[PDB]
Subunit: 163 residues, 3 copies
């Protein structure tokens, strides 16, 4: 038991109940979980990095071994800085599987200690992605069933500001 | 004998011979078929909502039980307002199947009376999508084999206007 | 014993080691291989057409039966002008297979002598796409493992110019 530290990277724009479920599950299996929020300058996110970090901390801060860090460059550099055991990614559908399989092979060529582990969503969260939730919210749809309360309120603020 | 009403939602940008075949098929099986054209403000369409509705009406007017309606894009609310039996989608490829499977599960959680039924294209239309036809037409390709006459003429007008 | 001429079309933005491996393999099997670089005005490329042609020449010019040509408009027209035997595409993953199956069917309806042949990548190149390489390079990642030397140097030039 060298002690395990797993990185869960994403743009979390915004965090959803799918992300909550995977972090919770991962937190039971590894000693440390780092929610790693990519700044994502290109494909420019709806919520600022600061807001996305705040939402994540609010939604998952009850788990004592979960840390929240914003990061900018490449996953493989971050993995090495963080001395991580593995990266964790959720797999929803075949398009996620093919993309992640490719990226894991790329990151392994860049760093032979890279490792990627995957979880599949619990059946009730299986369609939830941030992209879908943004689409619904932009059409003034109710996203209350799919995201934490702080995220509903952040969308309210976005609507008050024109979006 | 309960009356069935099925919604066929899309951006129809423009309507193609693929959409004509699915609507025709659906019209034979359900009492009422609503071609429901999402305004789609974001991912902004080539043709205006009014032009897309005109193209659809002119291409499907020979079917007596088809209605043509623009809507905002929020499908589950539209389904309820329309008192529909089901939403109809065409499935061309595995990417369509995965996405529609997910959205059907999402819409069912938002409304437990939601229903989605699917058709696959007839083999001669199986590669046709609006997206592909726009791309061909933009490169000054002949799309006459793939779309109704009114659409060919609409593309001509687009080219005369610089596109 | 007829001469074969195969077109390998793409945006090559930039050319990668994946493309190099497919062209090398194709050059052993066909008499003439035409690296055909679509100008691609829409989805506007990082590298100019002239730079993309020069990179491809630099990376593959050691194979004496490979030609390098820019084109605009439709692939099927270019195929006819070039009196080609077939178009060659690489298939990396299921999403490539679906898209190329569709386009082959569509191009055959536009020209019944169209033909498309496919190769799968060698296992060490199987994740590499121009889109991935651009993403990594934009985040200041090292792409040296995945692209020819000429492309690494073209990215250097891009960084010196602000990108």
């Amino acid at each position: 038991m060298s002690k395990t530290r797993v990185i869960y990277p994403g743009t979390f724009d915004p965090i959803t109940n799918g992300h909550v479920d995977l972090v919770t599950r991962a937190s039971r299996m590894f000693d440390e979980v780092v929610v790693a929020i990519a700044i994502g300058h290109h494909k420019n996110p709806l919520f600022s990095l600061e807001e996305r970090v705040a939402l994540a901390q609010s939604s998952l801060g009850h788990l004592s071994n979960v840390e929240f860090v914003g990061f900018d460059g490449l996953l493989v550099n971050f993995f090495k800085e963080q001395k991580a055991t593995a990266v964790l990614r959720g797999l929803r559908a075949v398009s996620d599987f093919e993309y992640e399989f490719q990226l894991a092979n790329m990151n392994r060529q860049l760093d032979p200690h890279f490792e990627a582990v995957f979880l599949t969503p619990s059946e009730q969260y299986s369609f939830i992605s941030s992209t879908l939730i943004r689409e619904i919210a932009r059409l003034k749809g109710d996203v209350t069933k799919f995201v934490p309360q702080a995220v509903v309120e952040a969308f309210e603020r976005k609507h008050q500001q024109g979006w």
